């Protein structure tokens, strides 16, 4: 769905939403498009192990440096493991193959760090982390459901983009969480802050597509 997201962003950005007449941004809000999932917390320990994250439903996941993935459901015991070849298996923290001991231990550490520390973003209407990268200004998180989340480090603003809803959720500096239909942003416009971040988003989606 990355190509679909790129086309949706091309379209909003070509409409010059902050550059025409009266902006009626509120008329572009669509609460029926609120995301089901987003990333509420993350820990980059990629110099050694990988990227650990919490989703807004309190489930956790890790994308390990070897491109395997472990996902802990919010029941606190049920696990999904995804091997390098895509094979998915189900198990629990209590009942697992000995070969997963190290990875399960690592997940417990990430999980405990994100339970004890850090603020839950978006404090909804499982996807796993397909890929991520960081720039100087942001971290870019691409979920397997097609959603792309962009967290800006300096000002703590965030975008959650969903190509299925063709929607963007913008979390501003005050932590106000508004969800917009992209095509309604074309129709009604938006502020220059949101417009700039959507221009950036397009560049990030191009980076995802060109590196997938």
């Amino acid at each position: 769905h990355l190509s679909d997201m790129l086309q949706q962003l091309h379209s909003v950005n070509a409409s010059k939403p902050s550059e025409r007449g009266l902006v009626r941004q509120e008329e572009a809000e669509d609460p029926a498009c609120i995301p089901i999932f987003w990333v509420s917390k993350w820990v980059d320990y990629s110099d050694k192990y990988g990227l650990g994250y919490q989703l807004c439903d309190n489930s956790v996941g890790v994308l390990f440096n070897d491109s395997t993935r472990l996902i802990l459901y919010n029941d606190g015991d049920s696990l999904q493991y995804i091997e390098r070849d895509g094979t998915e298996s189900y198990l629990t923290v209590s009942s697992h193959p000995n070969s997963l001991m190290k990875k399960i231990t690592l997940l417990k550490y990430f999980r405990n760090y994100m339970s004890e520390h850090l603020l839950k973003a978006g404090a909804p209407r499982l996807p796993y982390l397909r890929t991520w990268f960081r720039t100087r200004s942001a971290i870019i998180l691409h979920l397997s459901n097609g959603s792309v989340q962009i967290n800006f480090f300096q000002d703590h603003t965030k975008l959650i983009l969903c190509p299925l809803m063709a929607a963007v959720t913008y979390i501003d500096e005050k932590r106000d969480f508004r969800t917009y239909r992209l095509s309604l942003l074309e129709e009604y416009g938006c502020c220059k802050e949101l417009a700039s971040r959507l221009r950036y988003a397009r560049t990030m989606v191009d980076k995802l597509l060109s590196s997938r």
Partner: peptide
Amino acid sequence: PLHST
């Protein structure tokens, strides 16, 4: 940053 807020 190496972790979220």
